Amino acid sequence: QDHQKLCYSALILAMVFSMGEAVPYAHYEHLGTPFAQFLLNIVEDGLPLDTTEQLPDLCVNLLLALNLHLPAADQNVIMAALSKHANVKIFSEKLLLLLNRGDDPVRIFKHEPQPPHSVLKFLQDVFGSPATAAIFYHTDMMALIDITVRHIADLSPGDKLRMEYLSLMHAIVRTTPYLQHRHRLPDLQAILRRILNEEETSPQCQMDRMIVREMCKEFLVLGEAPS
Amino acid sequence: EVIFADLARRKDDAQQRSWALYEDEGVIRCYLEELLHILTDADPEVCKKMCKRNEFESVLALVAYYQMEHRASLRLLLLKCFGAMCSLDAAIISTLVSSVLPVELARDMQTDTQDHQKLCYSALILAMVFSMGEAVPYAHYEHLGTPFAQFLLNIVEDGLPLDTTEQLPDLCVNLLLALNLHLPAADQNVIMAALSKHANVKIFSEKLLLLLNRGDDPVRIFKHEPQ
Amino acid sequence: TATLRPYLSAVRATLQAALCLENFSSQVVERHNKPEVEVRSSKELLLQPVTISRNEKEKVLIEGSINSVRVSIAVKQADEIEKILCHKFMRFMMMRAENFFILRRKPVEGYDISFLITNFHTEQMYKHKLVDFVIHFMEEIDKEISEMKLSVNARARIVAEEFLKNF
Amino acid sequence: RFRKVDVGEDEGEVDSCLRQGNMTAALQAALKNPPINTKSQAVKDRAGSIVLKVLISFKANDIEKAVQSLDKNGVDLLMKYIYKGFESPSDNSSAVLLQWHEKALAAGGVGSIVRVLTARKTV
Amino acid sequence: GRLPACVVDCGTGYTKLGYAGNTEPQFIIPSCIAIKESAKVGDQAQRRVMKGVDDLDFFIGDEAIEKPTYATKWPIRHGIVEDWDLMERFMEQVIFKYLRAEPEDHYFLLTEPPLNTPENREYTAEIMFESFNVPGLYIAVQAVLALAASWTSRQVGERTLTGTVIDSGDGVTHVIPVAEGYVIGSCIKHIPIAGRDITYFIQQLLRDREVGIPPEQSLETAKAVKERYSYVCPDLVKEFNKYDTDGSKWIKQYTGINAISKKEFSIDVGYERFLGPEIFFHPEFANPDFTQPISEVVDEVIQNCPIDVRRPLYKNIVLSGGSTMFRDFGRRLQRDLKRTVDARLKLSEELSGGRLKPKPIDVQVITHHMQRYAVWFGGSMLASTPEFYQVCHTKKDYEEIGPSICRHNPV
Amino acid sequence: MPAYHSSLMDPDTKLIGNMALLPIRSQFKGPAPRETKDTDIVDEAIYYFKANVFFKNYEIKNEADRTLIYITLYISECLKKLQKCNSKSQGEKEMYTLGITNFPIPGEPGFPLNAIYAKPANKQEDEVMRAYLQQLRQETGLRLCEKVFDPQNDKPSKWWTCFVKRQFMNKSLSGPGQ
Amino acid sequence: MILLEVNNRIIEETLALKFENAAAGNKPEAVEVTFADFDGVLYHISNPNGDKTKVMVSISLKFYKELQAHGADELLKRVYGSYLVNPESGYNVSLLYDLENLPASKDSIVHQAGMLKRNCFASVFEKYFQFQEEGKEGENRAVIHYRDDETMYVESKKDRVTVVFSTVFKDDDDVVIGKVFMQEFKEGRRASHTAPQVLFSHREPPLELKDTDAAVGDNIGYITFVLFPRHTNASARDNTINLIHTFRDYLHYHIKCSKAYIHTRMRAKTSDFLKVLNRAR
Amino acid sequence: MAYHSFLVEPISCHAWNKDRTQIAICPNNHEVHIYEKSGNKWVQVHELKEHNGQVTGIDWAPDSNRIVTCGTDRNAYVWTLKGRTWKPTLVILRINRAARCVRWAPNEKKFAVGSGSRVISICYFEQENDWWVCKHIKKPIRSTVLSLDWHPNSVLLAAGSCDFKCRIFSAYIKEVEERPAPTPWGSKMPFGELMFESSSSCGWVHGVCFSANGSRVAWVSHDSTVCLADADKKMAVATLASETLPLLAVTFITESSLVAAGHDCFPVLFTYDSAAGKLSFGGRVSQISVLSGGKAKCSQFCTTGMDGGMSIWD
Ligand SMILES: Nc1ncnc2c1ncn2[C@@H]1O[C@H](COP(=O)(O)OP(=O)(O)O)[C@@H](O)[C@H]1O
């Protein structure tokens, strides 16, 4: 009933978790799934007092920060909420508008030992299981594959983030019905050709080439010759 | 110079002021709140010199805009500007008293009792301008006289359900004391007719003696020379 | 295929060489002053066209002249829906060419947008910020189209809901 | 109607050095024969295709040594061939020519590009 | 069977809607649009940004003029469409909600003000051909339709195909000479005064004189006293003296109802009975930079027309549009003109020694009951004719040539 | 265009500076002769005033226009005082004290129309036009004071005081230098 | 407006005005007006034979032959009764009121008059709903040419009444955008669990309809609604009939608006680009 | 860098008074402004405003104190200080397209105007008419003439052009001038004979200059190249291509060194040696001129540009 206190409460939790450190296990009595389900409802239809329409943005920011410290997708107290929520229309959309720009809302501060890029992290944690891979509407996931197939191409060698989009394609390929619709598969292969041949020699470039070798070994349709 | 130029150039935009099309609240708000700061952070003698520039055109244009504007947000900032201007110089006060501004404030208060914040500031600015005891146009008494005096007496006796600070009782005492200050003679005095006709005034009576007991004069709010 | 950083850097270094414009009254009419790249009426004042491309679909053509340079660029319409949305975005940007002083009111044939810089623009405007605008356009255009695709998908879903829920 | 009246108007050496692996010299071998004077068109398309084979078949890490081996004449010729390959896009070709561009630019500067634009006898 | 074409007259004050072949428009609606204003909480930094289906939450016409939670916008200004975003929405609800015509099979007759910039014709055709999907469009000159409305309504035997039409909408006044059905476009003159300027001048003059009208209703009362109490006066300085001396009869009380408190309020109505429409004869009042009376401009238009047509024009000055409806308007315009033309002749007697006396000129100023919707009626009669479907731009033309087919105009 | 212009420029009537010393039908002392016709230049100004203030361009025909315009500028100033007056008696006493104040004369600084009036060069020009303009002011104020106050209550009437805001082509005889 | 409203404003306005003056009694002023609606409907309101006291409304549905095969006649009589006079010449239905006898229930008679197009269509649905609600299944299938190249197929099945709208998209923009909207209709049950199943077949007839001369081509689309007993029953049939017969124009209406909505955003995105170039000045 | 922004807009030409007390400039319009060095700060002293269209070249005759101006209006005017106000004299220039450059001859008896009409007008005074009259160099000039410089003998004229080629012409006006001495460029020099042609074929030739001995011409081209033709090597020409943007103007400062400037907005020195016959980039906008010491041994030189203002260098 206090819209101002709610906004600051959400903002401070996002500020507090923004460095991704592990919490006392005692916290998850509250910070567990029931609170995650509460945050999804705030984004999906909001509150009558939110005449600024401002809580949905703060709560999207908060779920990204909350997940930032969890180690995996199977135990993940947030992803178990998304699985059980009746229908995640609005959250699905807002997450893509952030990925499209590719910025990280959770890095609100300049502290130097920075955590992973929160949205790339959150999506890799979504796709780690078939139950949460169904979050997306068909048109949304088509736009997702398009957005990531673009970002993987445009990022120059040696960027930390190019590995993350490679990992997110690996996740999408491995757990969605991808090879039965193949939406951008010609363009993906044409990029994976270039990435695998890339003669740059930095450690991150070696890691990018390795994850392509993992990805094509798992799915031989990748790396096949152009049509 | 820039602000008083642009405010004039909006005031006379006779198309936009009656058949609105452009969005203009934001730019006006920024110009008004910038004005309010300069009138209080800057050298008073510069601020005087721009108000009194061409027979107070900068002042009178801004007054004419207040009669014409009806966004309550913008009205409230204009009042704050008029107070700061009124503080600068008795020559500005006597201009404001002689212009239309007092009549619109009294008409506004009698009709729009709901904006408590504008209502308080309205009574403040109205008491400020009358504080010098300058003679008004007789046309002003038409609104300012006995009907308006009864309206103030009702507020100070009965209050309004929306006033939780009780500022209106005190401000309405000061406003009646300000309006009376300039009236000559005795019997025809428009305020005295209201006191005579009002049904059992009593809270005003005992509030008035508490002023006399201390002997202060709430109306002398400014240090201007001819006391 | 090729990454975006080399492609923009090659374009920048090229376009930086072409903006060495000069004032030049024409030879063909008494004392008219007109951009030679558009009038093309004498051909010893036209520079060799040069092209930079990062794949078979995204290409930047630079057409220099002693007093003007025309820059015309093509962007990848990867989807059927993007062709419509890109055309509309260019149309509404091109509909305002008097504000974008360096913009043509029609594209060059086979390009999606086309800028025309005169000597006067390099004399009045910051020359280096004109390059940065061409580059800033070229960076952002496909992010902007992607945003439109998402926003149309969202509207279609809400409109579908508002019908079915009444049954 | 008055108003409308119109009025008042080497390859056998290039592939030899390539197959020997003398790649740095294989760049030189291509640049010996500029068909600048040629009236023929197909000769130009041939010469551009031959040099493109060397630019593509070069290893990417060795482009620095290759360009640095050229003289300022060779660098201006190299640029004139680089900007030609961009007009025949192909899946790999654009990625390498954009790299050859950056290293030819570091050698020749923007002035080398101006001599592409001002070149009156189009190669 | 064959469905009647749609006629839409996008006035600066009132849009007029209906189908061809009707003696009246089916709707007269104020050309305004009410949009949801709550975005102003965010829109302090930049203009309101739309998402979802929020841009379908709007009302137009009488549904929009007094809604408690929507900001009314007025898209049209000097007859020109000034904000195409709002006008494009206004068209959607006009077509689908009011007319309920599927655009795909109805031709549209869509009117134009003679001052309309070519760029604005490109946009209006682009919206009608490409945002909608009209099968054919015709941008029609308002003045010719107004003359034909009088031609087809007035008595037989006096149906002259030539006249000077004065059209004073809410935005601008146009004086258009027509001979043998051809618009003499070179000779057109525009007077930058109309109903809005009369309204604003009354609105200012009340706010000087008569504080007590609440600002929200300042426009409402200025409009009401204009339409009900104002008249064109015979002589200004003498009228002030009449009002000063016989004020008991000339001053009229108006009583208004407060929009919020629903208390009544009342005002004297005074000099702004004859001031107001006087600005037609003294434009310097409302407009700083125009000074020729209407009775001066009309003569300059006629006396530029070919010598043969000048006499026919004076016989058939047609008044059109709602701002010409003031009582005694035409009577004074005639008197001023007659005093101007008969002196022009009298001079040419003396410069000829009286050897010949010229025939007089019979200045006549004519008025007809369609004047609130005369342009629309003239359109609905045009759109009934088979020639209309031959004159329209067909959709295939906009496929072969772009918006450029609508660059041209009568001038 | 045509605002009202002075009718009474008789060729017999002498000039000072660029202003015509038309006779005045006044009991106040002053150098111009005593008028006897019903109309008078002060009454031209007072009769035209309500109409004349609305026009925004004014073409000087002769010195009498430079004279009559001065009256209207002064009427647009006296209305400021008498709108505050509670009674006709107050206004009449007030107005007498207004007009005797030393208003600027042509070319003396702060005078609003230095482009259009030339300064009198000599004492017999200067003192006489001061003695003329003074009696014009004295009479002009009194003639308003007879007709602006409604006789039923000495209310300075709404219909006259309405004009106080409407300065004659934005020119003030108060002068913009203050 | 998100949904298209069902009642024609010109009837609703003019009859309400005329019946108001009848209640005031002041004057039987003449009326003669013609106007279209959607579906190529062509109404006419007139005084019959010049009797200014009588008012007659007429409909002119082009497809009324082979719609009155499915009732569309007894229904009009059941709903209008004494008001359903003989057809005016050239028109299939007429409906005559008079200012002398009209009841005090003015609002009911005027509102029901506005529904005249709906009350013509409603009989095909009401018939086939009553078949499904009574378990017949072998009956013939209703084909209704609600536009001249665009046909509705209403078919009864023991579990279902299905409504196939063939439709045609005139510009490639409308095909590309329309194909988006119906993808969101396909999944639309995910946010509305009770809603009818909507199927979209694009160029090709749906395989059960593939026993009639249904068209094929890039501009053609088939949309199939499935109406369950929760919709066709006697409590819900009236609202369901109101929705269904407007769907085709609902879809085309929102295609128009969505193009306009894009234009709003493009002007904004352009303005934020211009703001960059202004820093080069 | 001594600097002063006279204008924001392009200073389209400048010329210097005899003792450098005054500077004449175009403020990017059809007027010429003269400024006097009023102590540390410049003050405008005259405004020559007879032209009907933008002035494109100014020159100031140091011995005779006369200012000649030409413009895209196809006028030229010779301005003489009549008492206190500059008054123009007509030039019967007879060109059908814009003028582009003007230079007084070292003897100030004649001047030359280059133009878009593909000619060089050589002007001299015709005292019976009190106007200036022209003879046209014409035959090999295929396009517009961009810049001019005179040999110190006031007969040989070097011209750069849009048809990529620098050339030397013999502008011997037999009507006003005694026959010149033989030179290393040649012994023949009747009016309009062609003494030299550049080897170049690509870039436009923006700037041309003579050495103070007249034995060397240097030019600069849109190729970002400098060249120097030396008459004592029998017209062998050095070349140096460079990595930066083009050079717009050039001057000798000694017989063995040049200064140039270009779209890079800073001045650049090019030295030369008569042994090998090569230019060398000694390194470091619209035109350059020498303030003091002349082309033989300059001590100060100055520059103006499209970026606005004046700059002086040592
Ligand atoms: N009886 C009347 N007298 C004077 N003006 C009127 C009267 N009735 C309407 N008007 C005015 O007519 C003006 C123009 O209306 P209209 O002719 O519909 O304008 P447009 O057609 O250009 O939109 C409006 O300002 C309206 O106030």
Curated annotation (Swiss-Prot), chain A:
Gene Ontology BP annotations: cytoskeleton organization; endocytosis; positive regulation of neuron projection development; regulation of postsynapse assembly
Top-level taxon in the UniProt lineage: Eukaryota
Keywords: Chromosomal rearrangement, Nucleus, Phosphoprotein, Proto-oncogene, SH3 domain, SH3-binding
Cellular compartment(s): Nucleus
GO cellular component annotations of the record: cytosol; glutamatergic synapse; intermediate filament; nucleoplasm; plasma membrane; postsynapse
Tissue specificity of this protein: Highest expression in heart, brain, skeletal muscle, kidney and liver. Lower levels in placenta, lung, small intestine and leukocytes. Weak expression in colon, thymus and spleen.
GO molecular function: Arp2/3 complex binding; cytoskeletal protein binding; SH3 domain binding
Associated pathology: A chromosomal aberration involving NCKIPSD/AF3p21 is found in therapy-related leukemia. Translocation t(3;11)(p21;q23) with KMT2A/MLL1.
Free-text function comment from the UniProt entry: Has an important role in stress fiber formation induced by active diaphanous protein homolog 1 (DRF1). Induces microspike formation, in vivo. In vitro, stimulates N-WASP-induced ARP2/3 complex activation in the absence of CDC42. May play an important role in the maintenance of sarcomeres and/or in the assembly of myofibrils into sarcomeres. Implicated in regulation of actin polymerization and cell adhesion. Plays a role in angiogenesis.
Name assigned to this protein: NCK-interacting protein with SH3 domain
Lineage: Eukaryota, Metazoa, Chordata, Craniata, Vertebrata
UniProtKB/Swiss-Prot annotation, chain C:
GO molecular function, one term: actin filament binding
InterPro entries linked to this entry: ARPC2/4 (IPR034666), ARPC4 (IPR008384)
Subcellular location field: Cytoplasm, Cytoskeleton; Cell projection; Nucleus
Keyword Acetylation applies: yes
Modification type N-acetylthreonine: residues: T1
Gene Ontology biological-process entries: actin filament polymerization; Arp2/3 complex-mediated actin nucleation
Gene3D superfamilies hit by this protein: 3.30.1460.20
Predominant location category: cytoplasm
Cellular component, GO annotation: Arp2/3 protein complex; cell projection; cytosol; nucleus; site of double-strand break
Keywords noted in UniProt: Acetylation, Actin-binding, Cell projection, Cytoplasm, Cytoskeleton, Nucleus
Subunit structure: Component of the Arp2/3 complex composed of ACTR2/ARP2, ACTR3/ARP3, ARPC1B/p41-ARC, ARPC2/p34-ARC, ARPC3/p21-ARC, ARPC4/p20-ARC and ARPC5/p16-ARC.
Task performed by this protein: Actin-binding component of the Arp2/3 complex, a multiprotein complex that mediates actin polymerization upon stimulation by nucleation-promoting factor (NPF). The Arp2/3 complex mediates the formation of branched actin networks in the cytoplasm, providing the force for cell motility. In addition to its role in the cytoplasmic cytoskeleton, the Arp2/3 complex also promotes actin polymerization in the nucleus, thereby regulating gene transcription and repair of damaged DNA.
Similarity comment: family membership: Belongs to the ARPC4 family.
Descriptive protein name: Actin-related protein 2/3 complex subunit 4
Gene, per the UniProt record: ARPC4
Curated annotation (Swiss-Prot), chain D:
Subcellular localization, as worded in the UniProt entry: Cytoplasm, Cytoskeleton; Cell projection; Nucleus
Gene3D superfamilies noted in UniProt: Actin-related protein 2/3 complex subunit 5
Post-translational modification: Polyubiquitinated by RNF128 with 'Lys-63'-linked chains, leading to proteasomal degradation.
Keywords, sorted A to Z: Acetylation, Actin-binding, Cell projection, Cytoplasm, Cytoskeleton, Nucleus, Ubl conjugation
An individual GO BP term: Arp2/3 complex-mediated actin nucleation
Domain of life from the UniProt record: Eukaryota
Any one GO molecular function term: actin filament binding
Name of the featured protein: Actin-related protein 2/3 complex subunit 5
Organism the protein comes from: Bos taurus (Bovine)
Phylogenetic classification of the source organism: Eukaryota, Metazoa, Chordata, Craniata, Vertebrata
UniProtKB/Swiss-Prot annotation, chain E:
Keyword field: Acetylation, Actin-binding, ATP-binding, Cell projection, Cilium biogenesis/degradation, Cytoplasm, Cytoskeleton, Nucleotide-binding, Nucleus
Origin: domain of life: Eukaryota
ATP-binding among keywords: yes
Biological process, per Gene Ontology: Arp2/3 complex-mediated actin nucleation; cilium assembly; positive regulation of lamellipodium assembly; positive regulation of transcription by RNA polymerase II
InterPro entries linked: Actin (IPR004000), Actin/actin-like_CS (IPR020902), ATPase_NBD (IPR043129)
Primary location group: cytoplasm
Any one Pfam family match given in the protein's UniProt record, by short name: Actin
The UniProt record lists the keyword Acetylation: yes
Residues bearing the modification N6-acetyllysine: K238, K242, K249, K252
Protein's name according to its UniProt entry: Actin-related protein 3
